[PDB]
PDB file of C-alpha atoms and ligand atoms in Angstrom:
ATOM      1  CA  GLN A   1      51.124 171.926 -22.601  1.00  0.00           C
ATOM      2  CA  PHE A   2      54.081 169.445 -23.099  1.00  0.00           C
ATOM      3  CA  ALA A   3      57.353 168.609 -21.421  1.00  0.00           C
ATOM      4  CA  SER A   4      60.529 167.444 -22.777  1.00  0.00           C
ATOM      5  CA  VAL A   5      59.093 166.221 -26.204  1.00  0.00           C
ATOM      6  CA  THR A   6      60.934 165.794 -29.481  1.00  0.00           C
ATOM      7  CA  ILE A   7      59.747 167.797 -32.546  1.00  0.00           C
ATOM      8  CA  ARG A   8      60.460 165.781 -35.672  1.00  0.00           C
ATOM      9  CA  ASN A   9      60.173 166.863 -39.251  1.00  0.00           C
ATOM     10  CA  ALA A  10      57.758 164.563 -41.052  1.00  0.00           C
ATOM     11  CA  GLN A  11      59.582 164.763 -44.392  1.00  0.00           C
ATOM     12  CA  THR A  12      63.201 164.486 -43.274  1.00  0.00           C
ATOM     13  CA  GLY A  13      62.823 162.586 -40.051  1.00  0.00           C
ATOM     14  CA  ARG A  14      65.359 164.945 -38.330  1.00  0.00           C
ATOM     15  CA  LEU A  15      64.724 166.499 -34.964  1.00  0.00           C
ATOM     16  CA  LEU A  16      64.497 170.152 -34.086  1.00  0.00           C
ATOM     17  CA  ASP A  17      67.582 171.034 -32.097  1.00  0.00           C
ATOM     18  CA  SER A  18      69.363 174.149 -30.790  1.00  0.00           C
ATOM     19  CA  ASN A  19      72.454 175.309 -28.804  1.00  0.00           C
ATOM     20  CA  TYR A  20      73.417 177.766 -26.096  1.00  0.00           C
ATOM     21  CA  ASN A  21      74.323 180.388 -28.849  1.00  0.00           C
ATOM     22  CA  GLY A  22      70.749 180.393 -29.990  1.00  0.00           C
ATOM     23  CA  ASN A  23      71.333 178.487 -33.277  1.00  0.00           C
ATOM     24  CA  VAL A  24      68.426 176.286 -34.424  1.00  0.00           C
ATOM     25  CA  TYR A  25      68.720 173.339 -36.890  1.00  0.00           C
ATOM     26  CA  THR A  26      67.608 169.820 -37.317  1.00  0.00           C
ATOM     27  CA  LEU A  27      69.828 166.719 -36.785  1.00  0.00           C
ATOM     28  CA  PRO A  28      69.340 163.026 -36.738  1.00  0.00           C
ATOM     29  CA  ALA A  29      67.963 161.796 -33.440  1.00  0.00           C
ATOM     30  CA  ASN A  30      70.650 161.359 -30.763  1.00  0.00           C
ATOM     31  CA  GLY A  31      68.602 161.126 -27.474  1.00  0.00           C
ATOM     32  CA  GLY A  32      70.030 164.333 -26.129  1.00  0.00           C
ATOM     33  CA  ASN A  33      68.158 167.013 -24.220  1.00  0.00           C
ATOM     34  CA  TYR A  34      69.113 169.689 -26.813  1.00  0.00           C
ATOM     35  CA  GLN A  35      66.590 167.806 -28.971  1.00  0.00           C
ATOM     36  CA  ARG A  36      63.831 168.095 -26.411  1.00  0.00           C
ATOM     37  CA  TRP A  37      61.397 170.989 -25.985  1.00  0.00           C
ATOM     38  CA  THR A  38      58.900 172.130 -23.306  1.00  0.00           C
ATOM     39  CA  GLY A  39      55.642 174.102 -23.764  1.00  0.00           C
ATOM     40  CA  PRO A  40      54.392 175.612 -20.504  1.00  0.00           C
ATOM     41  CA  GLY A  41      51.137 176.775 -21.583  1.00  0.00           C
ATOM     42  CA  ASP A  42      52.035 180.359 -22.686  1.00  0.00           C
ATOM     43  CA  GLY A  43      52.545 179.427 -26.367  1.00  0.00           C
ATOM     44  CA  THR A  44      56.332 179.268 -25.980  1.00  0.00           C
ATOM     45  CA  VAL A  45      58.484 176.372 -27.174  1.00  0.00           C
ATOM     46  CA  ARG A  46      61.523 176.227 -24.817  1.00  0.00           C
ATOM     47  CA  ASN A  47      64.647 174.039 -25.313  1.00  0.00           C
ATOM     48  CA  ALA A  48      64.798 171.518 -22.564  1.00  0.00           C
ATOM     49  CA  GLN A  49      68.631 171.923 -22.240  1.00  0.00           C
ATOM     50  CA  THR A  50      69.110 175.586 -22.724  1.00  0.00           C
ATOM     51  CA  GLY A  51      65.762 177.030 -21.530  1.00  0.00           C
ATOM     52  CA  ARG A  52      65.822 179.469 -24.456  1.00  0.00           C
ATOM     53  CA  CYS A  53      62.653 180.235 -26.420  1.00  0.00           C
ATOM     54  CA  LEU A  54      62.100 179.332 -30.082  1.00  0.00           C
ATOM     55  CA  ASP A  55      61.777 182.632 -31.937  1.00  0.00           C
ATOM     56  CA  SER A  56      61.550 183.806 -35.541  1.00  0.00           C
ATOM     57  CA  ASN A  57      61.203 186.922 -37.679  1.00  0.00           C
ATOM     58  CA  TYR A  58      59.292 188.231 -40.755  1.00  0.00           C
ATOM     59  CA  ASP A  59      62.314 187.339 -42.920  1.00  0.00           C
ATOM     60  CA  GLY A  60      61.841 183.654 -42.115  1.00  0.00           C
ATOM     61  CA  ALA A  61      64.861 183.230 -39.751  1.00  0.00           C
ATOM     62  CA  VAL A  62      64.470 180.968 -36.693  1.00  0.00           C
ATOM     63  CA  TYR A  63      66.670 181.037 -33.561  1.00  0.00           C
ATOM     64  CA  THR A  64      66.405 180.824 -29.800  1.00  0.00           C
ATOM     65  CA  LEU A  65      66.640 183.733 -27.429  1.00  0.00           C
ATOM     66  CA  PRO A  66      65.917 184.361 -23.712  1.00  0.00           C
ATOM     67  CA  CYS A  67      62.186 184.185 -23.133  1.00  0.00           C
ATOM     68  CA  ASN A  68      60.777 187.659 -23.252  1.00  0.00           C
ATOM     69  CA  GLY A  69      56.993 187.278 -23.342  1.00  0.00           C
ATOM     70  CA  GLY A  70      56.667 188.635 -26.911  1.00  0.00           C
ATOM     71  CA  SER A  71      54.495 187.300 -29.777  1.00  0.00           C
ATOM     72  CA  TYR A  72      57.466 186.400 -31.920  1.00  0.00           C
ATOM     73  CA  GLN A  73      58.175 183.675 -29.298  1.00  0.00           C
ATOM     74  CA  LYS A  74      54.609 182.346 -29.387  1.00  0.00           C
ATOM     75  CA  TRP A  75      53.582 179.405 -31.588  1.00  0.00           C
ATOM     76  CA  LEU A  76      50.404 177.538 -32.462  1.00  0.00           C
ATOM     77  CA  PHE A  77      50.371 173.796 -32.919  1.00  0.00           C
ATOM     78  CA  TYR A  78      47.814 172.370 -35.314  1.00  0.00           C
ATOM     79  CA  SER A  79      46.522 168.885 -35.299  1.00  0.00           C
ATOM     80  CA  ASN A  80      47.703 168.481 -38.884  1.00  0.00           C
ATOM     81  CA  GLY A  81      51.300 169.183 -37.829  1.00  0.00           C
ATOM     82  CA  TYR A  82      51.772 172.850 -38.646  1.00  0.00           C
ATOM     83  CA  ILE A  83      53.740 174.904 -36.078  1.00  0.00           C
ATOM     84  CA  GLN A  84      52.843 178.566 -36.800  1.00  0.00           C
ATOM     85  CA  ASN A  85      54.386 181.719 -35.392  1.00  0.00           C
ATOM     86  CA  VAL A  86      51.810 183.879 -33.793  1.00  0.00           C
ATOM     87  CA  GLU A  87      53.356 187.270 -34.733  1.00  0.00           C
ATOM     88  CA  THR A  88      54.302 186.472 -38.351  1.00  0.00           C
ATOM     89  CA  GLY A  89      51.795 183.739 -39.317  1.00  0.00           C
ATOM     90  CA  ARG A  90      54.567 181.926 -40.968  1.00  0.00           C
ATOM     91  CA  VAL A  91      55.106 178.157 -40.258  1.00  0.00           C
ATOM     92  CA  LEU A  92      58.178 176.261 -39.142  1.00  0.00           C
ATOM     93  CA  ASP A  93      59.995 174.404 -41.973  1.00  0.00           C
ATOM     94  CA  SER A  94      63.256 172.676 -42.598  1.00  0.00           C
ATOM     95  CA  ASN A  95      65.322 170.775 -45.188  1.00  0.00           C
ATOM     96  CA  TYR A  96      67.539 167.793 -45.543  1.00  0.00           C
ATOM     97  CA  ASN A  97      70.636 169.956 -44.904  1.00  0.00           C
ATOM     98  CA  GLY A  98      69.325 170.686 -41.361  1.00  0.00           C
ATOM     99  CA  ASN A  99      68.404 174.381 -41.942  1.00  0.00           C
ATOM    100  CA  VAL A 100      65.273 175.554 -40.168  1.00  0.00           C
ATOM    101  CA  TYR A 101      63.288 178.637 -41.216  1.00  0.00           C
ATOM    102  CA  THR A 102      59.732 179.849 -41.487  1.00  0.00           C
ATOM    103  CA  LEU A 103      57.689 180.146 -44.687  1.00  0.00           C
ATOM    104  CA  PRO A 104      54.041 180.828 -45.449  1.00  0.00           C
ATOM    105  CA  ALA A 105      52.040 177.522 -45.254  1.00  0.00           C
ATOM    106  CA  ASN A 106      52.119 175.565 -48.494  1.00  0.00           C
ATOM    107  CA  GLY A 107      50.878 172.094 -47.531  1.00  0.00           C
ATOM    108  CA  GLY A 108      54.262 170.358 -47.993  1.00  0.00           C
ATOM    109  CA  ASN A 109      55.607 167.657 -45.737  1.00  0.00           C
ATOM    110  CA  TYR A 110      58.602 169.781 -44.831  1.00  0.00           C
ATOM    111  CA  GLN A 111      56.089 171.866 -42.796  1.00  0.00           C
ATOM    112  CA  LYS A 112      54.567 169.035 -40.888  1.00  0.00           C
ATOM    113  CA  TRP A 113      56.043 168.231 -37.557  1.00  0.00           C
ATOM    114  CA  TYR A 114      55.442 165.350 -35.112  1.00  0.00           C
ATOM    115  CA  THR A 115      55.567 166.473 -31.539  1.00  0.00           C
ATOM    116  CA  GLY A 116      55.777 163.955 -28.773  1.00  0.00           C
TER     117      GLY A 116
HETATM  118 NA1   NA B 201      63.349 167.591 -31.329  1.00  0.00          NA
HETATM  119 NA1   NA B 202      59.084 180.158 -27.751  1.00  0.00          NA
HETATM  120 NA1   NA B 203      54.857 174.022 -39.710  1.00  0.00          NA
END
């Protein structure tokens, strides 16, 4: 479990962030609570500001939605930095533009995250 941690992309250095409309992206660190995330212990990754759950689909889109208990909202954190969706098996990824998505694991640094 974790409370109010940042989730930083190892490659870009940008932080996972989201808004009340459910958009997810990365931005440079700004100290705000939209850039913090909380993991209760049920596999969810909840935005500390909005309370919405990180979610994704088989096409690789990522977004936040009200927490609904489903497997698309459950994530596995690996000690090597992967963040894997339980339903799809795809891992969280992002780019220098700030887009966030999921892709099959390919060992790249864009799929490594530092959570703390
Ligand atoms: Na973050
Ligand atoms: Na979640
Ligand atoms: Na990942």
